[PDB]
Amino acid sequence: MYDFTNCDFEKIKAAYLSTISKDLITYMSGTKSTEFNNTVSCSNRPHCLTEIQSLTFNPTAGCASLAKEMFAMKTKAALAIWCPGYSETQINTTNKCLEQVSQLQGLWRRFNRPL
Amino acid sequence: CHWLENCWRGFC
Ligand SMILES: *CCC(=O)N1CN(C(=O)CC*)CN(C(=O)CC*)C1
């Protein structure tokens, strides 16, 4: 569905670095990224947001939902504010949660990459 | 104003 091509990418990066990043780090609770060899890549800013959306908010076989976590709640708010039309689209097991959050941190690093 | 569910209000 939603196409992140019209978002204010710079504002979303400022929001991530200001407040979301520290919450993913807190969630990871000392587990390091080298515990997980499989990573998820992305190719440009909207594609990164698409994958960020999917890993943050979609249930998976190994991680039922992260939607109530602080980093997720803050992600949702950032997308609601800075992606035109995003909020309209939102009106309607834990064994892989750390792996998933570690993958999210990598997707955000690529989102945040200097141009 | 409609606040979304599970959505932080701190950017305001
Ligand atoms: C009343 C709702 C509102 O002001 N907005 C929708 N929204 C969210 O619901 C975030 C969870 C994003 N907005 C803001 O965050 C303003 C602080 C705008």
Residue A67 belongs to domain with CATH number:
1.20.1250.90
Put simply, the answer to whether A70 touches B4 (Cβ < 8 Å) is no
Residue A10 in tokens: 């710079």
Q: Which atom belonging to ligand 1 lies closest to the Cα atom of B7?
A: 11
Q: Residue A19 belongs to what domain range?
A: 7-111
The per-residue DSSP string of chain B comes to --PPTT---TT-
**Which technique was used to obtain these atomic coordinates?**
X-ray
d(CA A74, CA A59): 18
Q: Is residue A101 part of a domain?
A: yes
d(CA A67, CA A46): 21
At what resolution in Å was this solved? 1.6
Q: Is residue A82 part of a domain?
A: yes
Radius of gyration of chain A (CA): 13
The per-residue DSSP string of A25-81 comes to HHHHTT--GGG--------SHHHHHHHHHHHHHS--SS----TTSHHHHHHHHHHHH
- On whether the CB atoms of residues A103 and A36 are closer than 8 A, the answer is yes
What's at A11, amino acid-wise? K
